[PDB]
């Protein structure tokens, strides 16, 4: 019985930007969520359709591990039924989401003096994302009636903005690493247990 490779996902040295969020398929293995839930490091640990403490008792067919960085005050948008810049344009959970949302402050790793500009998010889009849809396009967003022709200006915005994380930011603006675990139960052997 091989252990769940949660280390590659939670302990990845770098995380994706939320607009290009990473997905890892987790199956085979059999790891325990008690230590994760009893960990003093995760500031958010919220589950839907399933109980975190009783996770060791349950078996599922597949697990998806999505990971990315957002700012602290956006963690509340990583939940079913939310709207806002992140839920609308970057990473959208379904209403019937079954899984857990885990986040922790990553200021020590992801902020730099003068700003870490590596992490981006999408501010504009012609429509809201469908659940688990991904958009990595970079066309100038034409908000107004003037064509942009690839240049910013009159109501013409580059769609991605850098978080520019600085260590002196308040915790609402500090970077948080997020792991979304989707517990899928289809018609297959339940190979992932606690």
């Amino acid at each position, epitope marked *: 019985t091989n252990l769940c490779p949660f280390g590659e996902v939670f302990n990845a040295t770098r995380f994706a930007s939320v607009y290009a969020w990473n997905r890892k398929r987790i199956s085979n293995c059999v790891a325990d969520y008690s230590v994760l839930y009893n960990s003093a490091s995760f500031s958010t640990f919220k589950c839907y359709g399933v109980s975190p403490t009783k996770l060791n008792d349950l078996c599922f067919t597949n697990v998806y591990a999505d990971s990315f960085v957002i700012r602290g005050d956006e963690v509340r948008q990583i939940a079913p039924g939310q709207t806002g810049n992140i839920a609308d344009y970057n990473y959208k959970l379904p209403d019937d989401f079954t899984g857990c949302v885990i986040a922790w402050n990553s200021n020590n790793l992801d902020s730099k003096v003068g700003g870490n500009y590596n992490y981006l998010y999408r501010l504009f889009r012609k429509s809201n994302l469908k659940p688990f849809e991904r958009d990595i396009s970079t066309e100038i967003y034409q908000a107004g009636s003037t064509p942009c022709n690839g240049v910013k200006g009159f109501n013409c915005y580059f769609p991605l903005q*850098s978080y520019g994380f600085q260590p002196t930011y308040g915790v609402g603006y500090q970077p948080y690493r997020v792991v979304v675990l989707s517990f899928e139960l289809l018609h297959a052997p339940a190979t992932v247990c606690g």
Partner: antibody
Amino acid sequence: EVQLVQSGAEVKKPGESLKISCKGSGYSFTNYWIGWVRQMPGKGLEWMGIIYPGDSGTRYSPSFQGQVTISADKSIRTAYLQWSSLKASDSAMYYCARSRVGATGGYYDYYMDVWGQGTTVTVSS
Amino acid sequence: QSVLTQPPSASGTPGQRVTISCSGSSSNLGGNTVNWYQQLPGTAPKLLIYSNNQRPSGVPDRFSGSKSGTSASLAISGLQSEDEADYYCAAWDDSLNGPVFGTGTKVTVLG
């Protein structure tokens, strides 16, 4: 190859109007922004503005908005920079340049890949 | 915060390596890539580096650019006499809604 050819040197007095030109060759003139850059003698480069000849849209630097007019005539592949009333302080070298735009790794790209040979403007009373 | 600051001058002997800094802010380099232009005396500027570190055809690999956050740098390895020129960094700036050129650096190949 892609080429920009500008008009000849200009000697003017303050108060006269002036229109200098920049003709493009070897590319689709209506598919690229073309812009103007000022270089006063001994000094650095200053971006003035751009026009998209496909639809005549313009973007002007705030330092040059309303001081000059940029235009284009796509039937003859030519862009223009115009003053209604020159000052001595308009004395400078002026370049036109073709813009290239896009994005790399989520960050905005804008650069000037083909340059005209420059037009000297000398204004004195 | 909308000026790209460059050292006024730089110099080296032939074969040496010279580096030219380009200092910006969140409104330009933070969300936009940097470019470099080379102007030999009496000539028009030419594109030297685009999008932080790409070289057009006809620019040798002795020129390399780099960008980290709000800072950028041009390195010239194995200085040759024809490299004596003014160098300008540049990027789009979102406060002004337009491209801005750096203040320029004069490079001398010590003869």
